[PDB]
Amino acid sequence: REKWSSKIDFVLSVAGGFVGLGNVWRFPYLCYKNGGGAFLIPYFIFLFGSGLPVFFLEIIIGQYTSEGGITCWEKICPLFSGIGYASVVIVSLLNVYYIVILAWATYYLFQSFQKELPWAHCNHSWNTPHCMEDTMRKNKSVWITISSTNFTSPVIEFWERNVLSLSPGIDHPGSLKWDLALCLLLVWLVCFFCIWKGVRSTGKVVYFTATFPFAMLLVLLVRGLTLPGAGAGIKFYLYPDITRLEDPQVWIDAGTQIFFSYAICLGAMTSLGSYNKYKYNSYRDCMLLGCLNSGTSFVSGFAIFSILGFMAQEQGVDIADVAESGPGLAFIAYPKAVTMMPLPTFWSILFFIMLLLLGLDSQFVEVEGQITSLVDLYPSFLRKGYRREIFIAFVCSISYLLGLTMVTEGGMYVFQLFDYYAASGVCLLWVAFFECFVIAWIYGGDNLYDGIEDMIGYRPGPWMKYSWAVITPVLCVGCFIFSLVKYVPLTYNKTYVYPNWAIGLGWSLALSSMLCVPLVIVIRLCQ
Ligand SMILES: CC(C)CCC[C@@H](C)[C@H]1CC[C@H]2[C@@H]3CC=C4C[C@@H](OC(=O)CCC(=O)O)CC[C@]4(C)[C@H]3CC[C@]12C
Ligand SMILES: CC(C)CCC[C@@H](C)[C@H]1CC[C@H]2[C@@H]3CC=C4C[C@@H](OC(=O)CCC(=O)O)CC[C@]4(C)[C@H]3CC[C@]12C
Ligand SMILES: CC(C)CCC[C@@H](C)[C@H]1CC[C@H]2[C@@H]3CC=C4C[C@@H](OC(=O)CCC(=O)O)CC[C@]4(C)[C@H]3CC[C@]12C
Ligand SMILES: *[C@@H]1O[C@H](CO)[C@@H](O)[C@H](O)[C@H]1NC(C)=O
Ligand SMILES: *[C@@H]1O[C@H](CO)[C@@H](O)[C@H](O)[C@H]1NC(C)=O
Ligand SMILES: *[C@@H]1O[C@H](CO)[C@@H](O)[C@H](O)[C@H]1NC(C)=O
Ligand SMILES: N=C(N)NCCS(=O)(=O)O
Ligand SMILES: [Cl-]
Ligand code: NA
Ligand code: NA
C-alpha cells in the first residue's frame, strides 16, 4: 500500500538484495569443482540467454501488477499460481540453511579477537600428528620422501575439526555443538531485532555500508593479484577444457549459479519492484544492476583463484588437490590470504565484518520478501501490529530449531545435501522454465511490450522477446533431460558415497518444491 519515498531507495535495496554471499562464496567452489573456464562458457551463455531477461521480467511484472510473490501471478494467469508457492518453499529452505554460513562467519569473528590467529599454525588440542606447516609442507627433504598424500594443512584441519568436527558419515550424527548454536541464536536475534523496528536505510551511513564491501574486495584483489602463482590460477580459471563439456554436471551447475546469484525465482524481486512508481524507467537500472552483479562475481573470481593458485604452488600439489570441492573453499582461501596482510588481526576483523554485512543485508531482503509474500495472502489477519511481530518471532524460532540439525558433528553432510537439492539445481530450472513459458506463449511478448512502452516511453528491442520465447525453455529442457539420461549420484567433497536413503531425502527436498506446480493445477482444475 506504500511506495518508495524516493527512487534511490529502490536502487539501494535492489543493490543490497542480490549482492552478497552468492558472488563471493558459492561461485568460487562451483567453478573449482569443475574444470574452470568450461564452467565459464555455459555461465555466459546462460547469462545473456536467461539471466538478465528473467530478472527484467520479474521487475516489470512487479511494477505492472503492484503485488508480491504469489498474487502477481494471479493478474497474469490464475492457473499457474503455483510458481509463487514454489518460490516461497525455495526461499524458506534457503533461509534455513543460508544463515549457517553467517554462524560460521561470526564464530571466526569471535575467534579473531585473540592476539594470534588460531589457524595460522597447528599446535593445538585438535591437531593430528600428520600436521605440518604450509610453508614446510613442500620440502624435498622431509615431505616428498614419504606420506605425501597423508599430510594435511592447519587451515583445513581447523575447519574440519574445531568448527565442524566431522563425523565418519551422515549416519553418525554425534553430539550437538553448543557454541555454534549460540552463534546461530545471536545472528537470528540480530536479524529479528532489525525487523522489530523496521529499520531501513540511513541518511549518511548508506554511502558507507554500500561502499565498504567494495573497498574490501578491491584490497582483496590487490593482495591476491600480487602473490606468486597467480598466473597459473588465472589460466586455470579462464582456459577451458572441451572434454568436460560432455558431462551434464557442468552445464547444470553453471546455469543455476546465475539463477542463485541474481535472486531469480525467489519472489524477492517481484516484490522489490512492486513499490516503484508506474511511470518510471526501470530498463536502464535493470541493465546497470545486472552489469554490476556480473562484474562483481567475475572480479571476485579473479581474486579468489589467484590465491588458490598460490596455495596450490605453495603445497606442491595439483590445483584440484588443494582446499575443498565443497562449501569450505572460502573459509580456507580467504583466511590464508589475510594471514599475510600486515596486522593480520585487523584485516581479519574487517573481512569478517564485511562478510557479515554482505550476508545480513541479503538475509534481511529475503526474509522481508518472504514475509511480504505471506502477508499479501492475509492482510486483515496479518495486519501491522503485534500479530505481524509474533509472526516473525515464530518464523525465526522454527528456522533456528530446524537449522540446529546442521551444527551437530554430522551437520556438514546435511548442509551439502541442502545446498545441492533445496534451493538450487533442477527445481530452479523447473520454475524458470515455467515462468518463461507462461509469459511468452500464454500471455504474449508483444502484449507485454505494449505495457512496457506505455510505462517506459519507447518500444524496446526484440531481444528479450526472442529470449523468453525460445532461448530459455530450450536450455532448461535440454539440461534436465541430459541430466536424467546420464545420472551420477552426489558425492561430498570427492571421496565419499552417500547412502541411498540420504539421496531419497534429497530428492524429497527437491520434489517438495517441484510438486507445488502440478498440485495447484490439479486442485484448480478439480473444481
Ligand atoms: C513446506 C514448508 C516447509 C515451507 C513452506 C510453507 C508455506 C509456504 C505453506 C505451508 C502450508 C501452506 C498453507 C496450506 C493451506 C492453506 C489454505 C488455503 O486456503 C484455501 O484453500 C481456501 C481458499 C483461500 O483461502 O485462498 C490458503 C493457502 C494456505 C494458507 C497455505 C499457504 C502456504 C503454506 C503456509
Ligand atoms: C522451513 C520451516 C522449517 C521454517 C519456515 C516455515 C514457515 C514459512 C511456515 C511453517 C508453518 C506456516 C504457517 C501454517 C499455518 C498458518 C495459518 C494460516 O493463517 C491464517 O489464515 C490464520 C487463520 C485465519 O484467520 O484465517 C496461514 C499462515 C500460517 C500462520 C503459516 C505461515 C507460514 C508458516 C509459519
Ligand atoms: C518435506 C515435504 C515433503 C513436506 C510436505 C510438503 C507438501 C505436502 C506441501 C508443501 C507446500 C504445500 C502447498 C502450498 C500451497 C498450496 C496452495 C493451495 O491452494 C490454494 O490455497 C488455493 C486453491 C484454489 O483456490 O483452488 C492448495 C494446497 C497447496 C498446493 C499445498 C499442498 C501441499 C504442499 C505441496
Ligand atoms: C605444541 O608442540 C609442543 C612440541 O614442541 C608440545 O610440547 C606441546 O604440547 C604442543 N601444544 C599443544 C599440544 O597444545
Ligand atoms: C627442509 O627440511 C630440512 C630438514 O628437515 C631443513 O633443513 C630445511 O630447512 C627444510 N626446507 C626449508 C625451506 O625450510
Ligand atoms: C597414507 O595414505 C595411503 C593412501 O593414500 C594409505 O595407504 C596409508 O596407510 C596412509 N598412511 C601412511 C603412513 O602412509
Ligand atoms: N538470492 C539468493 N538465493 N541468494 C542471495 C544472492 S547473493 O546476495 O548471495 O549474491
Ligand atoms: Cl554470480
Ligand atoms: Na547484500
Ligand atoms: Na549475487
**422 Cβ closer than 6 Å to some ligand 3 atom:** no
Distance of CA 263 from the midpoint of ligand 3 (Å): 23
Distance of CA 363 from the midpoint of ligand 10 (Å): 12
Residue count of the chain, please give it.
Answer: 527
Dihedral pair phi/psi, residue 30, rounded to 5°: -65, -40
With the most atoms of ligand 5 within 8 angstroms of its CB, the residue from 132, 134, 139 to mutate is: 139
CB 264 within 8 A of CB 5: no
**378 Cβ closer than 6 Å to some ligand 2 atom:** yes
Which secondary-structure segment (H or E) carries 350?
helix 344-375
Among the listed residues 270, 327, 272, 265, the one whose alpha carbon sits nearest the alpha carbon of residue 90: 265
**Rounded Cα distance, 68 and 65, in Å:** 9
Nearest CA to ligand 3 atom 9: 512
**Rounded Cα distance, 24 and 16, in Å:** 14
What nine digits make up the cell of 287? 541493465
Among the listed residues 266, 207, 285, 320, the one whose alpha carbon sits nearest the alpha carbon of residue 456: 285
Among the listed residues 278, 254, 209, 290, the one whose alpha carbon sits nearest the alpha carbon of residue 425: 254
Which secondary-structure segment (H or E) carries 303?
helix 283-315
What nine digits make up the cell of 252? 547444470
List, chain by chain if needed, residues with CB within 6 Å of any ligand 6 atom: 147, 149-150
With the most atoms of ligand 7 within 8 angstroms of its CB, the residue from 23, 92, 99, 261 to mutate is: 261
Would you call 212 exposed, middle or buried from its count of C-beta atoms within 10 A (0-12, 13-18, 19+)?
middle
Beta-carbon contacts of residue 11 (< 8 Å; ≥ 6 apart): 285, 289
- Cell 516484490 found at: 271
Dihedral pair phi/psi, residue 146, rounded to 5°: -165, 160
**92 Cβ closer than 6 Å to some ligand 2 atom:** yes
What nine digits make up the cell of 255? 546455469
Nearest CA to ligand 1 atom 2: 89
Among the listed residues 97, 37, 62, the one whose alpha carbon sits nearest the alpha carbon of residue 420: 97
| Strand stretches in 366-481, DSSP E | none
CB 261 within 8 A of CB 23: yes
Q: Which approach determined this entry?
A: cryo-EM
Would you call 505 exposed, middle or buried from its count of C-beta atoms within 10 A (0-12, 13-18, 19+)?
middle
**260 Cβ closer than 6 Å to some ligand 7 atom:** yes
What nine digits make up the cell of 188? 537470528
What nine digits make up the cell of 60? 516489470
Among the listed residues 362, 328, 367, 314, the one whose alpha carbon sits nearest the alpha carbon of residue 151: 314
**Rounded Cα distance, 105 and 342, in Å:** 21
- Cell 525453455 found at: 473
Among the listed residues 271, 289, 282, 285, the one whose alpha carbon sits nearest the alpha carbon of residue 456: 282
**Rounded Cα distance, 367 and 354, in Å:** 20
Q: Give the count of beta carbons closer than 10 Å to the beta carbon of residue 441.
A: 12
Give the 3-state secondary structure of residue 151.
coil
What nine digits make up the cell of 101? 554460513
**Rounded Cα distance, 201 and 375, in Å:** 22
Listed by the residue before each break, gaps in the chain with C–N over 2.5 Å are: none
Distance of alpha carbon 247 from its chain centroid, rounded?
Answer: 23
DSSP character at residue 202:
-
| CATH code of domain 7-526 | 1.20.1740
**Rounded Cα distance, 184 and 375, in Å:** 26
**393 Cβ closer than 6 Å to some ligand 2 atom:** no
CB 447 within 8 A of CB 469: no
CB 14 within 8 A of CB 292: no
CB 69 within 8 A of CB 271: yes
Give the 3-state secondary structure of residue 131.
strand
- DSSP states along 14-66: HHHHSSSHIIIIIHHHHHHHS-SSTTHHHHHHHIIIIIHHHHHHHHHHHHHH-
Among the listed residues 26, 16, 17, the one whose alpha carbon sits nearest the alpha carbon of residue 331: 26
- Cell 550424527 found at: 173
Please give the biggest Cα pair distance in the chain: 79
Among the listed residues 307, 367, 297, the one whose alpha carbon sits nearest the alpha carbon of residue 341: 307
- Cell 572441451 found at: 242
Dihedral pair phi/psi, residue 152, rounded to 5°: -145, 165
Nearest CA to ligand 1 atom 31: 85
What nine digits make up the cell of 13? 535495496
Ligand at shortest distance from the CA of 27: 8
242: amino acid identity, one letter: I
Q: Give the count of beta carbons closer than 10 Å to the beta carbon of residue 328.
A: 23
CB 237 within 8 A of CB 302: yes
**50 Cβ closer than 6 Å to some ligand 7 atom:** no
**261 Cβ closer than 6 Å to some ligand 7 atom:** yes
Q: Give the count of beta carbons closer than 10 Å to the beta carbon of residue 466.
A: 13
Distance of CA 122 from the midpoint of ligand 4 (Å): 9
**271 Cβ closer than 6 Å to some ligand 7 atom:** no
**Conformational region of residue 493, where left means phi above 0, alpha means psi within -120 to 50, and beta covers everything else:** left
CB 159 within 8 A of CB 107: no
Helices 500-514, 82-111: axis angle to 10 degrees equals 130
